[PDB]
Design a protein around this ligand. Structure first.
Ligand SMILES: *[C@@H]1O[C@H](CO)[C@@H](O)[C@H](O)[C@H]1NC(C)=O
Ligand SMILES: *[C@@H]1O[C@H](CO)[C@@H](O)[C@H](O)[C@H]1NC(C)=O
Length: 196
């Protein structure tokens, strides 16, 4: 793999069942994961061990909740993220343990502060549609790199669900990059839904 992708998602869009973390979806973008771009599932002999990240659990519950399957055991999601992505990300010294990977992921989420960025730009959940360019152009100005922005299609207009920012392999600095239904958002109107 060559780069990392910091993936954040909008709970009201991605939530699938009104349970657990999705019963009242958080009203802020949360962490989906920190993913090596081209490799997954790198070490079946290195299982997730919740005990190793015990210190991070309050932050993981707040910022890395399970808002896709919303299983009652929140650690099923983090296990999935570790096994699929973290074992590969551990080739990088800064990410070379469970604690370091998850801790760095949380740090990057704090440093990027996508939630404050959007709000400062005036991009808030609304009944009124935005244009996809509102998100893309404003995030490109703030982060200096082009995000990938992914949507659920109409099941009306597409709904924004996920924002991806690429990061360098060694130091996880912002760089340019160049699913459960999320696809690239089409140019045009997009709904950014206020949580239920
Ligand atoms: C798999 O992880 C174990 C536990 O960290 C480590 O000892 C081993 O070297 C890893 N194997 C590969 C191919 O990375
Ligand atoms: C990423 O690409 C954009 C769009 O072409 C460019 O303006 C920007 O300077 C690039 N950022 C980095 C960090 O390379």
């Amino acid at each position: 793999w060559k780069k990392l992708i910091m993936v954040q998602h909008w709970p009201e869009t991605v939530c699938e069942k009104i349970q657990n973390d999705c019963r009242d979806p958080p009203d802020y973008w949360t962490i989906h994961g920190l993913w090596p771009d081209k490799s997954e599932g790198c070490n079946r002999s290195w299982p997730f061990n919740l005990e190793e990240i015990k210190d991070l659990l309050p932050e993981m519950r707040a910022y890395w909740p399970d808002v896709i399957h919303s299983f009652p055991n929140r650690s099923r999601f983090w296990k999935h993220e570790w096994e699929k992505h973290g074992t590969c990300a551990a080739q990088v010294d800064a990410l070379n343990s469970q604690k370091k990977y998850f801790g760095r992921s949380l740090e990057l989420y704090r440093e990027l502060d996508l939630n404050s960025v959007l709000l400062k730009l005036g991009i808030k959940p609304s009944i009124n549609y935005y244009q996809v360019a509102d998100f893309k152009d404003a995030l490109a100005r703030v982060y200096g790199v082009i995000p990938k922005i992914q949507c659920l299609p109409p099941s009306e207009v597409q709904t924004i669900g996920q924002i991806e920012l690429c990061l360098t392999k060694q130091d996880q600095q912002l760089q340019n990059c160049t699913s459960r239904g999320l696809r690239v958002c089409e140019d045009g109107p997009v709904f950014y839904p206020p949580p239920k």
